[PDB]
Each structure stands twice: as structure tokens, then as C-alpha cells.
Design an enzyme around this catalytic site. Structure first.
Site, mmCIF file in Angstrom:
data_model
loop_
_atom_site.group_PDB
_atom_site.id
_atom_site.type_symbol
_atom_site.label_atom_id
_atom_site.label_comp_id
_atom_site.label_asym_id
_atom_site.label_seq_id
_atom_site.Cartn_x
_atom_site.Cartn_y
_atom_site.Cartn_z
ATOM 1 C CG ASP A 33 97.308 -12.876 -3.152
ATOM 2 O OD1 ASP A 33 97.332 -12.379 -2.017
ATOM 3 O OD2 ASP A 33 96.861 -14.003 -3.391
ATOM 4 C CD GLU B 227 103.033 -11.859 -4.118
ATOM 5 O OE1 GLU B 227 101.848 -11.822 -4.531
ATOM 6 O OE2 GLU B 227 103.828 -12.777 -4.414
HETATM 7 O O1 LIG Z 1 95.728 -21.673 -4.766
HETATM 8 C C1 LIG Z 1 96.209 -20.789 -5.768
HETATM 9 C C2 LIG Z 1 97.714 -20.784 -5.745
HETATM 10 O O2 LIG Z 1 98.158 -20.357 -4.389
HETATM 11 C C3 LIG Z 1 99.625 -20.189 -4.295
HETATM 12 O O3 LIG Z 1 100.037 -19.139 -5.108
HETATM 13 C C4 LIG Z 1 99.864 -17.821 -4.543
HETATM 14 C C5 LIG Z 1 101.123 -17.349 -3.818
HETATM 15 O O4 LIG Z 1 101.565 -18.338 -2.867
HETATM 16 C C6 LIG Z 1 100.876 -16.074 -3.082
HETATM 17 O O5 LIG Z 1 102.084 -15.474 -2.566
HETATM 18 C C7 LIG Z 1 100.052 -15.058 -3.857
HETATM 19 O O6 LIG Z 1 100.729 -13.898 -3.943
HETATM 20 O O7 LIG Z 1 99.536 -15.432 -5.228
HETATM 21 C C8 LIG Z 1 99.592 -16.845 -5.678
HETATM 22 C C9 LIG Z 1 98.303 -17.114 -6.388
HETATM 23 O O8 LIG Z 1 97.263 -16.961 -5.477
HETATM 24 C C10 LIG Z 1 100.335 -21.481 -4.723
HETATM 25 O O9 LIG Z 1 101.746 -21.248 -4.821
HETATM 26 C C11 LIG Z 1 99.832 -21.995 -6.031
HETATM 27 O O10 LIG Z 1 100.430 -23.299 -6.284
HETATM 28 C C12 LIG Z 1 98.331 -22.128 -6.052
HETATM 29 O O11 LIG Z 1 97.852 -22.604 -7.322
#
Ligand SMILES: OC[C@H]1O[C@H](O[C@H]2[C@H](O)[C@@H](O)[C@@H](O)O[C@@H]2CO)[C@H](O)[C@@H](O)[C@@H]1O
Ligand SMILES: OC[C@H]1O[C@H](O[C@H]2[C@H](O)[C@@H](O)[C@@H](O)O[C@@H]2CO)[C@H](O)[C@@H](O)[C@@H]1O
Ligand SMILES: [Cl-]
Ligand SMILES: [Cl-]
Ligand code: NA
Ligand code: NA
Ligand code: NA
Ligand code: NA
Ligand code: NA
Ligand code: NA
Ligand code: NA
Ligand code: NA
Ligand code: NA
Ligand code: NA
Ligand code: NA
Ligand code: NA
Ligand code: NA
Ligand code: NA
Ligand code: NA
Ligand code: NA
Ligand code: NA
Ligand code: NA
Ligand code: NA
Lengths: 667, 669
Positions: free
Chosen positions: A384, A413
């Protein structure tokens, strides 16, 4: 750039950041090498490509807190030499260009231009000197040619044997080399084929539990998740990507549709890692035990799938690290820790980590977590937002991991500015997410495809049609036809591509108008889906996704990045591009519509030499989508009706070996 | 190129062949530096350009045979790219390094200004700011800390956030932080070289003349062989035309064996002078003067005459021998001896043997070095080197290296009319200036590509644009009449910071030896060519006044010293060409509008790229024509007309570019 000696070697490629990082390649990939090589006068110059395998030792790319002698051919670009090598194993390979004076080719040019006694005898001494470097069994052809030159008579008879193809071919294998100048050595890190060519399917294990008799979703387990794998393998995907599988924070848990407050029974975001049940080295209690995860990995392997786990370096407020290690966080003057951010995105359910307070502790702890998952059969990590963590940490981590297991791959990502996106790829990220989803016009898609080809030595794209965070406005308004359009584009432009579960059911509803978030996002609630019932009703893209993966497996041109070439099609809603495989000659041409509603027609003007043909050649094509066969030439009528097919994916005539290596040249 | 640490530095420019060769500059030139600098998150990053002077030690740029100022860098409009510059003030080896660092105070100042919300919300940020000012104060001299310490106490005092943040955001605190910034995670880049030469290496006006053709004629109208004394008498008119370099073909004894006759005849007639490039006879070699020119003492008086007139002498350096040169007798090891014992002629050059540098590298290298040092000891600081692409490349790097380490003001012009890799390759190896494909670039599209290529190669090569040479009478000049002579001179003098003219060009000499040839009829290479420039000038049949005006315009406009600032502007006529240059040092700006048609009038609207001239599209401004004196009111779209019977070009003095805009216009990416 190179070396200046008696022979000059300059502007060597592939070279990344002046040699600061190795170039990228995979086992069985044809790697082209170019170099400018020159000397004085009208005298012949030549070059040798020296290639060596260095084993699996991987370099540290940031500051922490028997060789093969291969021929190089002169190009149509004056003073530029071209070579290639095909690495056959994972690890660090190096190459070097050696420049040399070719006295015999200089003699041959001078004598032919002249057609003399002095020149003829000079030739004889050169062939005699050449013979000293030729095996005893092959010397005769040179010695006899020298004797003819020495013998008295007509100059045409005397020079006949020395000017023959027999002598010329023998010298092309054992050359008389003068003033051998050694170039600089450049590195190429060579990964397993999946680093470039892989098909990814993203799914949440908790959503594989189905429903009870009242239509209430039931939380899935590693056992139910394993049962959801045969259909993914049948669609032709080889990587199963899972969001985080650890316990989820109970403090500041997010509710449905990204609500700041969770209601009882709300599952929360899998990215809010950790609670009193465990951290990054634990499994979510509702999914099962670490033994249940091991059985899920074995089931995936039996189906020919490999597991990719999400590596999210952050903590829920109740994660064990939040109590045991306060030094790994930025504590504000009032004693609090600010919630993680990625403007304009807010993550109220998590704390970001601090890598600067105690580097040695946190580096060793993340290394421990990754090593743990590798020991449980995970060789791929989807990382991430790497652009929010220190760049030198990633270089250290990837280096430590690759030195213990060179087959471990990392997908970045990083939806960030180009310098950081490509900078992270340079630092060791195997694959990178791209701006694909936001490239929708003909101009945007042309520029995008040309850019991924141009960056092939530096980065490998992974084209995801959608993700849990991205439901693009084009998919929201274009209906099923647009779902098929984006899948053609990703599968044929991307040697690595991906689909997030539900795409095959045409899920297109955003949370609110103007948003790219899915309504009832699976990130915050259980989302079981009945794929088999949608299939039975002819309401699924599952057969089409299956066909795209079959076309990819049948056509090695689709493993390529650098061979992308766009062809002229006189309609702004139609796009055409080809790829070829330099290894087999396999060639594919894609004609795709960007209009998912109405039919589109035009004249397609093929760049024939790029297809290894002459302008007036006529040839047969076979559409891999319909099976329809057409006889085409340089200018062809094309018509696409989204109701029948959104694209033609054509098997083209094979490009011959000589022509395909030439079309692979860098300049 | 760069480095990766806690901060990443990438794609640094100027870098030549990955750092294998130093970039080029001259004393007083503004050198721009660019680098991509990045880190994690939304936190601010900054960069410092570290500049050092290493003295006049010159590097050896090839393998021979066995025998600090801290300068600020500005963030640009291109994300993640930082721009800097330095102006070297003396000859020698300069190096620069880019240092990247986290800038916590800039991140804090941005976050605080955005919120400035009430006291309770901003409290933590105000307290973080106080700690940052204290971290910064530790790197500040004790006598200057006060302002930072007071601003930190004010940030912590209770009250309205505007009043608390006041001193912390003040100009006084800001100025102090600009002098002693708080730099975190300082990441040091790679050190790159810049060889800095005297200004003449870039900006110089050359006139080529044969000393033997300065003797005039006898009472019978027969040319008289000139001497160094008559050649010195031909210098005042060259200095009055505004040239500062006089280039002489070889001044040594000429071979008597296989001497070429008039018009490149393989056999000479008694009394024929031969080619000056067939160096050497029983009278001496490369360290000797032709006996008909005078002695080595007469040459010293010629150089003194040139210096007193403001000219410097460039000698032709031709590494080849006539069959009767002393070396061909004394050192057969310096030649390719064929199986019958003879030496083949150079390639067609029947009057000379080429040298072999591979049989005895140590001997021949040392002998060429002795010859060059001999001429430097006689006041020669510039050598025009013949066909360097026919001699080993490592020999040139070694020679220029040995010379420049002892005499750093010695310059070398490469006469290499070869393929781009070798032409630019020799410039990278150390040639100060290079001849170009200029004469063969005649159409609007060829001249546009040509100008843009010379600007793109400014870090590696400096062009010298000769309108003609004794070997090149271009077809455009043979068929264009006097108007074409005027057009080609505007192009060379305004596109080329170094340019040249070969004697007789001002008399419009246009007759070739035969149709389809670029050789002059009765070529001065094989016969004496005295010319009465004074009578042609009195009859109004000379370009001498126009060449004088072009050199005057060049001296008046520092924009004409520049290579990298050339920009072409769209003009709606295939026979018209328009381009500007500017000086980043002073803001001096010049715009040329030139016709490529010497026969008839040509008109069009000229569409200016206004931001490239430091202006807005709606702007209106005044210009002054340097050729006619006329002033005009201009905008973005301007009507232009050139009648070649009146003037073949407008050379316009444009409004000065302001300081901030000119450094921005100099940016690499
Ligand atoms: O629970 C933390 C956060 O998770 C999600 O955000 C992620 C995202 O979905 C992933 O693709 C990743 O790359 O990084 C983000 C942060 O971990 C939720 O979209 C978000 O609402 C939530 O707070
Ligand atoms: O005498 C040798 C040779 O001299 C001339 O060629 C010169 C040329 O003029 C120069 O510009 C220089 O760069 O190299 C050439 C070789 O030195 C004559 O043109 C030629 O006929 C003559 O043989
Ligand atoms: Cl790495
Ligand atoms: Cl003269
Ligand atoms: Na090299
Ligand atoms: Na390839
Ligand atoms: Na090259
Ligand atoms: Na050559
Ligand atoms: Na070459
Ligand atoms: Na592959
Ligand atoms: Na770090
Ligand atoms: Na593909
Ligand atoms: Na650097
Ligand atoms: Na840059
Ligand atoms: Na404080
Ligand atoms: Na002797
Ligand atoms: Na000449
Ligand atoms: Na004319
Ligand atoms: Na001539
Ligand atoms: Na002439
Ligand atoms: Na003439
Ligand atoms: Na004269
Ligand atoms: Na310059």
C-alpha cells in the site's frame, strides 16, 4: 555513456540513472542492447556484447539509516551497434560492450573499390595473422586465400578466395580484432516470468461465506475462500490477491459506506490492522487459524494459483505495536497521535508509522513480518501507498528479502506523481499500479501505451480495470460494453493485468454522484456474490474474461511491453495497436472501440514494415474473439458494433527472425 | 543520474556520457543545473547546489597507449524538479553537486497558513513550530538566535493564533532561515565536472587568409609571393571589420615531391606554389616557416602586429607530411610502409603521406607535443585542427590534456566534416569548437532543425559557423548573387557565437572549378590569390561594410554570445525565417527575421511566442532594427516584409527580459 580508448564506446542502453540502478527483465525475455562505437578514418569497426550471469545476489539500492561473447550488428543508424541476450535464469546479469578495429573488413572495402599488388600482399599478411586465432581444422580456407593473393597474375583471380563468402563467414566467427577497448559493465536484474506476465484477481476472503436463509451475509473463512478459488483458476487468473487477513481494530472502527462510527456487527476495514487478538503476524479470528491459511495456500497451489498478500504498514489504535512501541509513532505535544492521511483521503481508523525515531527496531520488525508470510508460502506482496514511507526503507526491505528468496515479488500501489511512481520502480518494485483507469480518450490511451513501452527497462505495469477504491466514471456511465472495452485494453496493453471481484457482474453504482467509491463498498461490509447464477442467466463477463486470459496464453506477443505500436485509424472513437514477440515472431493487432453504445466504422492504415511486411502485401488474419477470418492489406475497412464485439484481437502473420530482431532495436 | 538515500536525487543535468566527460562553459556564462529531488508523503523537500573550483588541472579524457559555495535551488513548475545556476568567474575545472534535504519549516509554514481555525485546533501545530525554530536556532550563530528564540516563546504564549504565529511568519525570521536553513536528512549527490574556458572559446569572429596571397602584384600583373611582413600589413582591414581571430593555412615549407599544380592538377609546373597542407621539404618540417614567408623572427613580428590590432592568431595543425618532409626520411616507423617499401598517399591527397600513430605511439605523441608547444612559445593560443576524425581519438584527448594542463588558455577547433557520432564525439573528447553542416543547410526546415540541434548540444560542442572555406563554395552562393552572400552572413553571425569568413567572400567570389563542384575556380589552395579589397570597396562592389556591421551588432548584443537560448518563431512564408536569442546575464534580447530568397520581396505575418520573450500574448512593445535604424510598435502578430535589394534581414533589439523571467526561461526541463 561509455569509455574513450583507441576505440570510442558511447550512449550505451539499457542504462538507468547513469548506472545507479539495474534495468529489469524476466527469464526468456529478449533484451536489446545498443551502443555507439566509432574510430578514426574509413576503417572498419566492430563490437562484441559480453554477457555474464552473477548468481542470485541482489544489490542494496539505497543508503540505509563463463561469459557469453555475442555479435553486435551495425544498424541503419550510422555508428550504432545492436545486440541482444535472453537470460535463462533468475538473478543478476551484466553486460558490457567491447569495441574493436576490424582490419580485414577495411581491406575488403578498399580492394573492392580499387577493383593493386601492395594491397593484395597486405591482405595475405592479415589472413595469415587471422589464421593464428582460428582452430587448426578451419585454418586452410584463410591460408589458401593468402597463397592466391601472393601468387602472380590478374588481381581478380588473386583476390577471389579472400573476397569470398566462405572466408567472410569464417572471420565472422573467429575475427582478427585490433585495439580491443572494454566498455563499462551494466546490470540487469532478472526475475521469474510472473514479474512481467501474470493475471490477477482480487477477492476478500470474508465475502466468500454466502448467506443464511434470511438473506443475511455470513462471514467467510479460509475454508470457504478456498472453495471460491476453482472459478478464478477457470477464468485463467494465476495470482489471487487478498486485502489484509489480520485481526481488525476495534477502536475507531469504520462503519458501512466509510462511516466514521461502526454499528454493532460492523466488520470494519481490513486495512485497520491489529487488535488484542494480534497484529501483522496474526490471522483474523473469524477467518480461522494460521493452519487454515496454510491449507488455503495449498489449495491455491493445487489449482495453479499463487497468493499475493496486502502489506499495509500502519496500525489500528488497538494494534499490539501501539502499546509496546510508542516510539514507532509521531506523538504530538499534547500526547496524542494524528490519524493517517493521504490528502484528500482521511483514515480515522489508523495510525501512520514513524520510521525516523527508531529505524533499527521498525526495519527489523517489518522484515520479521514479511519473512513470516514467506515461510507460510506467500511469494508476492501488494504494497500500500509506498510513496508515504521512506524510499530507502523499501530498497533495504526488498534487498534483504530478495537475498533470502529471489522469487519474492512486490507490487507498488503508488498513485503518485511520475518522479515518485518510476522512482519507486527504480528502487526495486517488481510491478507498479498506473494511471490506466483515468486514461479514457484515444489520445490519453495512445500516450499511455507509448509511455509504458518507453519505460519498459524501468517499470512493469499491472493494469487493474478496477480496484475496491476505483470505480471510474467511464464504467459508471458506459454499461456492459464499457466493462468489455476496459478489459480488452488492460489484457492487451498490460502483460500484467487485474480485476477486482464484482467487475464480472457489471457493478457500477458509486456511493454518491461524482465519486469513484463503490456504493456499499466491500471495504466496510460483507459482499457475498452469486457468480454461478449470473453466469447461468447470461449476465456475467466471466466467459469474456476467460477468453481474454486464453488469448494471452496462446499469444506470447501479449507478454511484451517494448513492442507496442499504434496504427492510424480515421475515427476518434477507434484505437488500433499491435505487439510482437521477438522470440517466436507471434504478432497480435487490436482494434477496439471507445464507444460502448453505437457502432463505429473507419479505414485502418497499417504501418506495414512494423508488421514485417511491404505496403502492397496482402495477408490473412483470424479474429480471436469471433473466429472470423479476413484478407487484409495496408488499408482496411473496420467496423465495431458493441452489441456483437467491442474489439477485434487478430492473430497476424509471423514476423520472420531477421525482421523481428531489427524491429526490436532501440534507435 | 544521482543517488538514493532518505532523499532521492535523479536525472541530474548537465551530465555528459553518464559523467565520462565534463560539460563545457566559458567565464561569465550562466550555467543552468536541473535535478529531480523527491521524498515520501506531502512533506516539503529542498535542494542546495554545491559549487567548487579545482584550479586549472585538466583531466585525461581517454586511455593513452602503453608507451565551496552553497547555492539555493528553486522548485519549478515541473513537479519534483529543482533548478539552480552558477556563473564561473575564471578558467579551469569547476564541479557542482546537488544536495537534497527535507524542509520541515516550509511544510509547517504551509500547514499553519492554510488553517489560519481557532486556538484549540492550531495549538499542537503552533507548539510543533516552536520546536522547529529551536532546532533551526542550534545551527545559527549565538549573536543571531534572538529572533528565533522570541518567535518560539510567542508561539507557546496563550492567545489568538494570528498573534502567536506572527513573529514565526515574519520576514526577519524568514530571512534568517534563508541564511541558516533547518535541513533534515541531507543527501549528497554525485560531483559532476564543468571545464570553463576563456570567453573566445564560445564567442569569436574568424577571418581566414593565406599569408602568401598578401604580396600583391608586380608591374607585369603577376602575383608576388607574400611574406609575414606583407601579411601583417593585411591585418588592419581585418581588425576594422571586427574579426578577432585571424586563421592561417599551414605556414611551413611546402613539399617539392608530387607537388600539386593550379586547380588541383596532380603535376606541378615550374613556379607553382603547391598546397600549404603538403607540409615539409629539405627546408624543414612542422617547426619551420616557409622560406618565402620569411624567418621565425618575422613570424613573431606578425603575431605582435596581430595582438596590437586586437587579433589573435590561429594556426592550422595538419598531422601529415609531404614525401620530402624530414620525418618521412628520419622516422619511417611513423608511416604505413607497404610490402614493396613505399608509403601510400593520404585519402584524394597525392601530395601527402598520412601518419601512423600505432607503430611507435610514444615517439610520435612526444614529437607532435613538442611541435604544438613550439608554436605556443611563439604566441599561438588557437589551433584549427585538420580532419581530426582521421587520427586516433585517444591521441587527441592525450594531446589536448597535455597542452591545457600547462597552458589552459590554448583552444582547438575541430575541422571534422563527418557523421554526428564522430563530430560530437570529438567535441566531448576536448575540442573547444567544431565545424558544422551549416553550409549544406539552406532551406527553412534545414536551418530550423540546425539551429535547434546546436542549442540542444550546447553542453558538449560549440559551433563555429563558416559561411565559406577554401574547400566549400556552396551552390547557394554560386547561384544566389550578392544577396545570398549577405543572407548566409546574417545566419552565421546571429546563429553562431563563433563564426568565420574565408578571404574573397566579401568580393562575392562565386565561380566553381566545374559545374556540380563545391571547389573554387583557380583555388587559392594551389595558386597565389592577391585581391584588391580597397578598389572593390571604393567601387561599392564589396561586402566589407556589411561584415563590419554584423560584427558591431554582435559586440553590442550579449544575446548573440548564447547557444542554448535560440527559439524559432512562426512566420507564414516558406522563404522567411525568424528566431530570437537572449542573454540570461543581462536580459539582452535579439530577434532576427531573415529572407532565404535573394531575388524578390517576401512578406508574412510573424507570430511571436510571447512567453519566450518574457511577455504576455496581449502585450504591445517597441523594437529597434539594427540594420536600418527603424523602430516599430509590435505585438503577438506582426506584419513583416524583406526586399533583398534594400535589406536581407531585420536584426531587432527587443525589450530586456526581467531577471526572474530570464533564469526561468533558461531552465532545462
Ligand atoms: O482502514 C484504513 C483505510 O483502509 C482503506 O484505505 C486503503 C486502501 O483501500 C488500499 O488500497 C490501500 O492501498 O491504502 C488505504 C489505506 O490503508 C479505506 O479506503 C479507508 O477508508 C480506511 O480508512
Ligand atoms: O596538400 C594536401 C591537400 O591539401 C588540401 O586539402 C586539405 C584541406 O584544404 C584542409 O581543409 C584540411 O582540412 O585537410 C585537407 C588535407 O590536408 C587540398 O584540398 C588537397 O587537394 C591537397 O591534396
Ligand atoms: Cl531494491
Ligand atoms: Cl587574403
Ligand atoms: Na561503455
Ligand atoms: Na523484449
Ligand atoms: Na547509442
Ligand atoms: Na571508421
Ligand atoms: Na562507427
Ligand atoms: Na514473460
Ligand atoms: Na528510512
Ligand atoms: Na498484454
Ligand atoms: Na546526484
Ligand atoms: Na531532472
Ligand atoms: Na513546543
Ligand atoms: Na636515421
Ligand atoms: Na582549406
Ligand atoms: Na542576389
Ligand atoms: Na576550392
Ligand atoms: Na576563389
Ligand atoms: Na573562384
Ligand atoms: Na589581398
Ligand atoms: Na553556452
Amino acid at each position: 555513456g561509455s569509455v574513450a580508448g583507441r576505440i570510442v564506446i558511447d550512449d550505451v542502453q539499457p542504462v538507468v540513472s547513469n548506472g545507479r540502478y539495474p534495468a529489469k527483465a524476466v527469464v526468456g525475455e529478449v533484451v536489446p542492447v545498443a551502443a555507439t562505437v566509432w574510430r578514426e578514418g574509413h576503417d572498419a569497426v566492430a563490437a562484441t556484447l559480453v554477457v555474464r550471469y552473477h548468481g542470485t545476489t541482489y544489490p542494496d539500492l539505497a543508503d540505509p539509516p563463463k561469459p557469453q561473447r555475442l555479435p553486435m550488428s551495425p544498424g541503419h543508424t550510422p555508428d550504432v551497434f545492436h545486440g541482444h541476450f535472453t537470460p535463462d535464469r533468475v538473478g543478476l546479469w551484466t553486460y558490457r560492450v567491447d569495441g574493436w578495429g576490424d582490419p580485414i573488413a577495411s581491406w575488403r572495402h578498399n580492394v573492392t573499390a580499387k577493383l593493386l599488388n601492395n594491397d593484395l600482399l597486405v591482405g595475405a599478411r592479415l589472413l595469415e595473422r587471422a589464421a593464428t586465432g582460428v582452430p587448426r581444422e578451419l585454418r586452410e580456407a584463410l591460408l589458401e586465400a593468402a597463397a592466391a593473393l601472393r601468387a602472380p597474375g590478374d588481381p581478380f583471380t588473386r583476390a577471389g578466395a579472400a573476397l569470398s563468402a566462405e572466408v567472410s563467414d569464417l572471420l565472422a566467427e573467429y575475427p582478427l580484432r585490433e585495439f580491443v577497448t572494454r566498455g563499462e559493465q551494466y546490470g540487469v536484474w532478472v526475475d521469474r516470468p510472473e514479474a512481467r506476465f501474470s493475471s490477477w484477481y482480487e477477492m476478500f476472503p470474508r465475502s466468500t461465506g454466502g448467506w443464511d436463509a434470511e438473506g443475511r451475509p455470513v462471514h467467510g473463512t479460509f475454508a470457504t475462500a478456498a472453495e471460491a478459488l476453482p472459478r478464478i483458476a477457470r477464468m485463467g487468473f494465476d495470482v489471487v490477491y487478498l486485502p489484509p487477513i489480520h485481526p481488525i481494530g476495534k477502536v475507531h472502527r469504520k462503519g458501512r459506506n466509510n462511516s466514521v462510527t461502526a454499528a454493532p456487527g460492523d466488520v470494519g476495514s481490513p486495512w485497520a490492522i491489529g487488535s488484542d487478538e494480534g497484529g501483522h503476524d496474526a490471522v483474523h479470528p473469524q477467518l480461522g487459524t494460521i493452519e487454515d491459511f496454510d491449507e488455503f495456500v495449498a489449495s491455491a497451489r493445487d489449482l495453479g494459483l499463487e497468493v499475493a498478500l496486502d502489506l499495509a504498514l500502519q496500525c489500528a489504535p488497538d494494534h499490539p505495536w501501539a502499546r509496546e512501541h510508542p516510539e514507532w509513532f509521531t506523538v504530538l505535544p499534547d500526547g496524542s497521535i494524528a490519524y493517517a492521511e493521504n490528502p484528500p483521503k482521511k483514515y480515522q481508523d489508523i495510525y501512520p508509522l514513524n520510521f525516523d525515531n527508531d529505524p533499527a527496531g521498525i526495519y527489523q520488525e517489518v522484515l520479521r513480518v514479511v519473512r513470516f508470510w514467506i515461510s507460510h508460502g506467500v511469494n508476492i506482496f501488494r504494497v500500500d501507498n509506498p510513496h508515504t514511507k521512506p524510499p530507502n526503507f523499501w530498497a533495504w526491505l526488498i534487498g534483504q528479502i530478495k537475498n533470502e528468496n529471489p522469487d519474492v515479488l512486490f507490487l507498488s500501489e503508488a498513485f503518485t506523481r511520475p518522479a515518485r511512481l518510476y522512482g519507486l520502480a527504480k528502487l526495486g518494485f517488481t510491478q507498479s499500479y498506473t494511471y490506466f483507469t483515468w486514461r479514457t480518450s484515444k489520445w490519453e490511451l495512445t500516450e499511455f501505451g507509448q509511455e509504458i513501452a518507453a519505460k519498459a527497462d524501468i517499470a512493469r505495469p499491472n493494469l487493474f480495470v478496477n480496484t475496491p477504491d476505483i470505480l471510474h466514471e467511464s464504467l459508471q456511465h458506459g454499461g456492459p460494453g464499457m466493462f468489455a472495452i476496459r478489459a480488452v485494453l488492460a489484457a492487451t496493453m498490460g502483460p500484467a493485468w487485474g480485476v477486482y471481484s464484482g467487475y464480472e457482474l457489471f457493478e457500477n453504482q458509486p456511493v454518491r454522484p461524482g465519486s469513484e467509491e463503490y456504493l456499499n463498498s466491500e471495504k466496510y461490509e460483507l459482499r457475498p456474490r452469486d457468480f454461478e447464477s449470473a453466469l447461468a442467466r447470461g449476465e456475467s463477463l466471466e466467459p469474456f474474461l476467460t477468453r481474454l486470459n486464453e488469448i494471452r496464453r496462446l499469444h506470447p506477443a501479449l507478454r511484451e511491453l517494448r513492442t507496442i505500436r499504434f496504427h492510424h485509424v480515421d475515427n476518434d472513437a477507434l484505437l488500433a495497436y499491435s505487439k510482437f514477440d521477438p522470440g517466436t515472431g507471434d504478432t497480435v493487432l487490436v482494434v477496439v472501440t471507445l464507444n460502448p453504445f453505437g457502432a463505429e466504422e473507419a479505414t485502418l492504415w497499417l504501418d506495414m514494415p512494423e508488421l514485417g511486411m511491404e505496403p502492397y502485401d496482402r495477408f490473412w488474419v483470424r479474429d480471436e474473439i469471433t473466429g472470423e477470418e479476413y484478407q487484409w492489406g495496408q488499408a482496411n475497412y473496420v467496423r465495431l458494433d458493441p452489441a456483437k464485439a467491442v474489439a477485434h484481437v487478430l492473430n497476424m502473420p509471423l514476423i520472420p527472425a531477421d525482421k523481428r530482431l531489427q524491429l526490436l532495436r532501440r534507435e
